[PDB]
């Protein structure tokens, strides 16, 4: 009578497969608002 082959694994080998990696490319960077000009002139200078 021939012996049937071995068909067993440890839980580590079938559950802990070397996993694929998550998406490394996650770049975010907020833009800079365009500044507005300065439009003031002191009251002594405006009219004296």
């Amino acid at each position: 009578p021939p012996t049937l082959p071995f068909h067993g694994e440890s839980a580590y080998r079938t559950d802990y497969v070397p996993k694929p990696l998550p998406e490394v490319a996650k770049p975010v960077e907020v833009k800079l608002p365009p500044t507005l000009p300065f439009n003031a002139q002191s009251c002594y200078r405006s009219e004296y």
């Binding site: 975010v28 907020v30 608002p33 500044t35 507005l36």
Partner: peptide, 25 residues
């Protein structure tokens, strides 16, 4: 450094930044 908790929802002036009815005529 992912400054989302400083992500401006305001502008240079203080305020903040930019985010039916069937009328009986």
């Amino acid at each position: 450094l992912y400054a989302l908790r400083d992500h401006l929802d305001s502008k240079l002036v203080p305020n903040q930044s930019t985010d039916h009815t069937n009328v009986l005529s």
